[PDB]
Design an enzyme around this catalytic site. Structure first.
Site, PDB file in Angstrom:
ATOM      1  N   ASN A 116     131.851 124.629   0.758  1.00  0.00           N
ATOM      2  CA  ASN A 116     131.986 124.988   2.157  1.00  0.00           C
ATOM      3  C   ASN A 116     133.459 124.927   2.575  1.00  0.00           C
ATOM      4  OD1 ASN A 116     131.199 125.578   4.794  1.00  0.00           O
ATOM      5  ND2 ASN A 116     130.335 123.543   5.203  1.00  0.00           N
ATOM      6  N   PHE A 117     133.741 125.366   3.797  1.00  0.00           N
ATOM      7  CA  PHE A 117     135.091 125.351   4.353  1.00  0.00           C
ATOM      8  C   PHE A 117     136.165 126.133   3.581  1.00  0.00           C
ATOM      9  CE2 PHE A 117     133.077 121.253   5.787  1.00  0.00           C
ATOM     10  CZ  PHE A 117     132.874 121.645   7.109  1.00  0.00           C
ATOM     11  N   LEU A 118     135.759 127.175   2.865  1.00  0.00           N
ATOM     12  CA  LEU A 118     136.733 128.006   2.161  1.00  0.00           C
ATOM     13  C   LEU A 118     137.544 128.689   3.273  1.00  0.00           C
ATOM     14  CD1 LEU A 118     138.030 129.683  -0.078  1.00  0.00           C
ATOM     15  CD2 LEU A 118     136.011 131.172  -0.032  1.00  0.00           C
ATOM     16  N   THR A 152     126.525 129.275   1.126  1.00  0.00           N
ATOM     17  CA  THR A 152     126.114 130.389   1.958  1.00  0.00           C
ATOM     18  C   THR A 152     127.335 131.253   2.208  1.00  0.00           C
ATOM     19  OG1 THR A 152     126.576 129.194   4.020  1.00  0.00           O
ATOM     20  CG2 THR A 152     124.359 128.977   3.090  1.00  0.00           C
ATOM     21  N   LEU A 392     125.896 123.114   6.567  1.00  0.00           N
ATOM     22  CA  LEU A 392     126.750 122.978   7.738  1.00  0.00           C
ATOM     23  C   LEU A 392     127.793 124.082   7.943  1.00  0.00           C
ATOM     24  CD1 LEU A 392     127.332 119.111   7.459  1.00  0.00           C
ATOM     25  CD2 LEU A 392     125.481 120.377   8.629  1.00  0.00           C
TER      26      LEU A 392
END
Ligand SMILES: CCCCCCCCCCCCCC(=O)SCCNC(=O)CCNC(=O)[C@H](O)C(C)(C)COP(=O)(O)OP(=O)(O)OC[C@@H]1O[C@@H](n2cnc3c(N)ncnc32)[C@H](O)[C@@H]1OP(=O)(O)O
Ligand SMILES: Cc1nccn1CCCCc1ccc(CC(=O)N[C@@H](CO)C(=O)N[C@@H](CCCCN)C(=O)NCCC2CCCCC2)cc1
Length: 392
Positions: A116-118, A152, A392
């Site tokens: 996440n947070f790419l 995602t 998230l």
């Protein structure tokens, strides 16, 4: 008299050209260092995910980062940043967080990670830095003997498990209209809309109370029982579930995740729900600068076996919507995953213009139902989706 280096043969020399100079360098972030947390916060605040029309941008707070990136078992070297050598400025980031999931149809449990947070600074895009970040986090995760990942993203990626659609339930319609989040339907007025979305200011269910540390084990058993219906699901140790449902229970009172339970007369827990707060920054608006937003997280009910299921589920979500008002929530969101399609229509959730794809890295399985019609992308009522995990 003779050579200075030890003997070697062509096999001992690298077959790929040496790397040329770069203005950037890797940098492992330490979020326990407030100044580094400030840098990460700044990077995403100005450069993270926006809607298709560049009207809104996700706004992850400091508290949200500490909760999301520090579940038990978290690793500092899995918080990968990239910096400009000359100034030391953080311009890119990507993170891996441990997670355990189960594919119920083949009863298979996999200790994995969630990516996440790419994020890459707006001024450094299209330089193909992203593929490098992805390969580097892959390297660092593989080093810990983990070979699968869950994440995602947008349509830009091949073969997803399925595709889900975002749903929106207005709490403060007027503000949503004011910022362009929602439009006025024809022959309808601002007052008729406000009246149609109005809800009570106090929850209706008897037994509803905030979840506490004493409820973890019982709520987990309830969730596990309920979760069997889906294809892919998340598993937790008691401390993991405590973290995700209550946060790092210092003096308690997490400002990012809200958990509620419903216990009956005999003190038995029959239902529960949770949701997290992740607002939208309003890019260009002179009256509002932020939109309060809640996202449905994990939930369960012991009535899934009884005929009053759909009804009870609607009452449960209705109370969730009611509780969110206490926290300045302007719109309540969820996806067409889990059994959400069972309550979308009656709780007045509307379809949004955004979709979410689910991916499994290095693991093939049968595709799943995303709660929407595969062809028209429209919601399909009372449909159990294969997706039982929320990210998230
Ligand atoms: C076992 C462990 C394995 C762990 C790893 C598992 C996989 C994890 C995978 C990542 C999970 C992410 C989970 C999330 O955080 S999804 C959130 C993604 N973040 C954002 O959307 C923030 C706003 N946008 C940006 O910051 C940038 O546009 C990003 C950083 C997204 C791309 O930077 P840029 O715009 O400058 O592009 P480029 O020139 O550097 O690179 C070219 C492109 O890079 C690939 N690309 C672009 N966007 C995505 C994307 N959303 N997922 C996967 N791949 C993506 C794509 O192949 C294309 O190459 P190709 O199509 O031409 O070949
Ligand atoms: C979220 C996340 N965490 C980790 C990864 N990801 C996914 C990131 C990549 C995919 C992605 C991109 C962008 C978004 C933001 C987005 O587009 N959200 C949409 C989801 O629908 C939205 O809020 N849309 C609004 C605003 C649109 C403004 C113009 N673009 C909407 O449809 N509003 C309609 C409200 C209305 C519906 C009918 C009933 C009444 C209310 C989400 C996910």
């Amino acid at each position: 008299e003779g050579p200075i280096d030890k003997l070697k043969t062509p096999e001992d020399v690298p077959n790929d050209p040496l790397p040329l100079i770069s203005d950037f360098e890797w940098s492992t972030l330490d979020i326990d260092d407030n100044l580094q947390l400030d840098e990460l916060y700044k990077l995403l605040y100005d450069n993270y995910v926006e809607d298709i029309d560049a009207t809104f941008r996700f706004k992850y707070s400091h508290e949200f980062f500490q909760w999301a990136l520090k579940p038990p078992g978290w690793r500092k070297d899995w918080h990968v940043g990239v910096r400009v050598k000359s100034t030391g400025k953080l311009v890119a980031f990507i993170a891996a967080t441990p997670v355990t999931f189960k594919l119920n149809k083949s009863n298979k449990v996999i200790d994995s990670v969630e990516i996440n947070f790419l994020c890459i600074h707006k001024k450094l895009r299209n330089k193909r830095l992203a593929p490098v970040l992805i390969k580097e986090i892959t390297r660092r995760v593989n080093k810990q003997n983990i070979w699968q990942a869950l994440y995602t993203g947008g349509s830009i990626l091949p073969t997803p498990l399925t595709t889900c659609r975002y749903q929106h339930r207005p709490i403060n319609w007027s503000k949503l209209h004011d910022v362009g989040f929602s439009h006025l339907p024809p022959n309808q007025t601002k007052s008729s809309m406000v009246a149609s979305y109005t809800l009570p200011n106090n929850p209706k269910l008897k037994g509803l109370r905030p979840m506490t540390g004493k409820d973890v084990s019982t709520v987990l058993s309830l969730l596990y029982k309920y979760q069997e219906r889906f294809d892919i699901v998340q598993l937790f140790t008691e401390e993991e579930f405590k973290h995700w449902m209550l946060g790092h229970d210092e003096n308690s009172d997490s400002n990012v995740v809200k958990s509620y339970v419903v216990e009956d007369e005999n003190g038995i827990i029959t239902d529960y729900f949770s949701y997290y707060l992740l607002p939208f920054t309003v890019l260009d608006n002179a009256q509002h600068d932020e939109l309060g937003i809640a996202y449905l997280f994990y939930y369960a009910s012991d009535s899934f076996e009884k005929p009053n299921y759909k009804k009870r589920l609607n009452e449960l979500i209705t109370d969730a919507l009611i509780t969110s008002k206490k926290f300045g929530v302007d719109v309540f969101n969820c996806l067409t995953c889990q059994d959400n399609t069972y309550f979308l229509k009656d709780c007045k959730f509307g379809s949004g213009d955004g979709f979410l794809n689910y991916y499994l890295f290095n693991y093939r399985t049968f595709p799943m139902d995303g709660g929407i019609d595969k062809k028209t992308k429209e919601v399909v009522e009372d449909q159990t989706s294969g997706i039982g995990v929320v990210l998230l």
